Amino acid sequence: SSGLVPRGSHMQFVNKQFNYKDPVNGVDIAYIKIPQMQPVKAFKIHNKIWVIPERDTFTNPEEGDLNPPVSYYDSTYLSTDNEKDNYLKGVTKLFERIYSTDLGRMLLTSIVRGIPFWGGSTIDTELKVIDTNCINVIQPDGSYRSEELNLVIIGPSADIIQFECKSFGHEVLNLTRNGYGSTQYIRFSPDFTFGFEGKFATDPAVTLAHELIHAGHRLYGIAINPNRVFEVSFEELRTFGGHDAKFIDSLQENEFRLYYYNKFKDIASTLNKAKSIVTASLQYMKNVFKEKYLLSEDTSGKFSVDKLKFDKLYKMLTEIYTEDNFVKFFKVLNRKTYLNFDKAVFKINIVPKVNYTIYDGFNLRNTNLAANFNGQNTEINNMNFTKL
Ligand SMILES: O=C(CS)Nc1cc(-c2ccc(Cl)cc2)n[nH]1
Ligand SMILES: [Zn+2]
């Protein structure tokens, strides 16, 4: 048994207990393609969020193969159906685990609300989607429909340990850094994890939560350029939080706010100028992004950015949604700075409720493993951790 619904009748964030073998239906189980590949079977676990239980050979054309040229490879991983089902379930469980915490509910709500802006038009009076913020969803009868989405969780490329939150860019627009945002893809595996020193293992809910925090930043187009580094990038230090984030430059973070506060006013000015759209009323999409960015509307219908709601939204995404705060809500052991990852990679299986639960992770209550983080101790609980 998986223990995917420890309390209540049904999972609270993921919409169905999928089986990889479940039939396609064009709604939440479907063959999809990323705007050329071969159709891939995907699961829609929530509004705006799809799971592709496949190795990623799609996003980067330069990464279409799974052999080698801090790392680990294995072309066997995630090639059979039992594996795709185990991964679909592992990702499911972890969403439920994250949503079982106040902070995770806040974060996943923010993500679903962060629809990528409709800035894909070359006519300033016109709202239009950007079609790289979409997937094509094949129906049972063979037809496509283009569906917008915020977040895709997909398997890793050749380098199974490399986890990242990446997205498709625009010729001219820096979508992750102008406020618009864009559809985020997280290369992630629930099937392996990292060691840190007593020799323990990182709880995979923390790691998924890390990448989601990047997804939040990137969905509201307030990411820190990856060229700003110490190499550790500012974006990584922010996402980790705790005392690592203090080292970000002083007032240049206060620059960052002003920059993106202005970027949000450029978006508000764009919504006001909108006079046409290319179904869904111009009214309806303007509201969508009113809700997203917390825009104010006057009796006249003009949009603007309230400084205080901006601050609260940009404080929420950049300082509250951190890896360190998740460590705290999860009450797990984590490395204390972004660098203290030692090079231990472990195979794990979190899907068996006997191995790890939505509420306790590995540190199973009322057992050996509940005290002193034993469940995360790769030697005490070596049952759950196979070193590579
Ligand atoms: O941390 C990031 C940016 S989200 N990327 C990353 C680090 C790793 C990694 C690889 C190996 C080990 Cl031991 C620890 C972490 N994979 N992907
Ligand atoms: Zn990161």
Side-chain angles (χ1 to χ4, degrees):
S1 176
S2 294
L4 289 175
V5 183
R7 285 183 167 101
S9 63
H10 297 86
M11 294 184 296
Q12 297 187 2
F13 184 76
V14 176
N15 292 328
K16 288 185 180 187
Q17 296 197 9
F18 295 111
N19 292 308
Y20 185 77
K21 295 67 58 191
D22 285 333
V24 159
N25 61 22
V27 180
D28 66 5
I29 300 169
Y31 293 110
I32 66 173
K33 307 193 85 168
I34 304 167
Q36 196 275 122
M37 55 178 279
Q38 205 64 255
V40 68
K41 188 181 180 182
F43 302 48
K44 188 182 179 185
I45 55 165
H46 191 88
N47 297 106
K48 307 294 179 175
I49 306 178
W50 284 84
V51 177
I52 298 165
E54 297 268 332
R55 303 291 294 272
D56 187 6
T57 58
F58 316 111
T59 64
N60 185 352
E62 286 176 351
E63 301 183 358
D65 176 357
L66 306 181
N67 306 63
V70 55
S71 176
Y72 176 71
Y73 306 46
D74 181 3
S75 301
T76 286
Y77 171 65
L78 196 67
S79 64
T80 63
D81 287 347
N82 290 321
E83 278 175 328
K84 301 181 185 175
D85 186 67
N86 195 32
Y87 156 136
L88 181 58
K89 285 176 170 66
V91 171
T92 290
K93 183 178 274 189
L94 293 168
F95 274 96
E96 293 296 310
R97 176 159 168 82
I98 294 163
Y99 200 82
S100 79
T101 64
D102 285 332
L103 188 64
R105 285 193 294 282
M106 284 173 262
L107 169 62
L108 281 167
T109 297
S110 307
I111 287 180
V112 176
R113 249 64 151 186
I115 309 301
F117 183 70
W118 281 27
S121 175
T122 53
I123 307 170
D124 296 332
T125 197
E126 195 185 14
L127 289 179
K128 182 180 177 181
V129 77
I130 299 163
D131 61 11
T132 61
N133 297 321
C134 295
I135 57 171
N136 287 325
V137 179
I138 300 166
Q139 289 293 319
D141 67 352
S143 59
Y144 311 111
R145 59 172 163 83
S146 180
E147 169 171 346
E148 311 184 13
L149 77 171
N150 299 349
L151 184 62
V152 175
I153 308 300
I154 189 166
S157 295
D159 189 6
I160 294 164
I161 51 82
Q162 183 65 48
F163 299 165
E164 67 185 6
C165 179
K166 295 295 172 189
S167 66
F168 293 104
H170 191 273
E171 268 186 349
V172 311
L173 296 173
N174 282 313
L175 300 180
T176 62
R177 297 195 300 272
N178 70 358
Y180 290 182
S182 63
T183 299
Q184 299 298 320
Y185 299 42
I186 292 171
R187 288 178 176 180
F188 174 78
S189 175
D191 288 315
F192 316 52
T193 189
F194 304 141
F196 61 92
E197 293 186 357
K199 313 196 180 78
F200 306 51
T202 301
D203 183 336
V206 176
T207 297
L208 181 58
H210 183 90
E211 300 301 330
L212 293 172
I213 294 163
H214 290 299
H217 299 163
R218 292 168 64 87
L219 283 175
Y220 296 51
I222 58 163
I224 301 167
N225 184 0
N227 71 359
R228 303 295 317 179
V229 308
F230 282 52
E231 285 185 356
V232 70
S233 68
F234 292 0
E235 173 63 29
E236 296 298 332
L237 296 173
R238 169 173 292 171
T239 296
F240 188 83
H243 301 310
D244 280 341
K246 305 300 195 305
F247 290 140
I248 285 174
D249 188 355
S250 300
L251 315 172
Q252 209 171 15
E253 166 52 23
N254 202 352
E255 276 184 352
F256 295 158
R257 284 177 164 85
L258 178 58
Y259 183 80
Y260 295 122
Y261 169 68
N262 284 315
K263 291 293 186 183
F264 286 6
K265 302 204 289 191
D266 290 334
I267 296 171
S269 297
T270 302
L271 291 167
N272 292 323
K273 290 185 174 67
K275 302 299 178 193
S276 68
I277 193 170
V278 293
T279 302
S281 181
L282 184 64
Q283 179 58 34
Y284 179 74
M285 284 298 162
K286 286 169 72 166
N287 260 317
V288 172
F289 302 124
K290 177 180 175 181
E291 182 74 27
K292 174 177 176 183
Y293 298 103
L294 311 184
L295 301 182
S296 290
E297 191 177 2
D298 65 2
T299 63
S300 182
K302 180 180 177 181
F303 287 159
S304 71
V305 178
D306 178 355
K307 184 252 178 62
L308 273 75
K309 300 200 306 308
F310 174 80
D311 282 338
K312 202 76 199 296
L313 173 58
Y314 162 140
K315 174 173 177 174
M316 201 65 69
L317 291 163
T318 64
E319 296 186 357
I320 307 298
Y321 299 164
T322 64
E323 193 185 340
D324 179 69
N325 282 326
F326 278 98
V327 176
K328 297 189 180 183
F329 285 44
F330 283 144
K331 287 179 165 61
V332 299
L333 191 74
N334 205 31
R335 71 198 189 281
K336 298 299 188 297
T337 186
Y338 182 77
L339 293 312
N340 285 332
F341 58 95
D342 72 2
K343 182 50 165 290
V345 182
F346 300 99
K347 186 76 170 71
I348 60 171
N349 189 9
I350 66 182
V351 168
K353 169 171 62 178
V354 298
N355 295 336
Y356 149 149
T357 66
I358 283 164
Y359 291 119
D360 295 339
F362 299 112
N363 298 318
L364 302 174
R365 63 183 61 189
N366 298 117
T367 68
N368 188 2
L369 301 179
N372 296 313
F373 310 101
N374 291 324
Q376 276 172 316
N377 178 333
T378 62
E379 314 191 358
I380 299 171
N381 194 7
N382 62 331
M383 166 171 68
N384 282 107
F385 304 99
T386 297
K387 189 174 173 77
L388 272 47

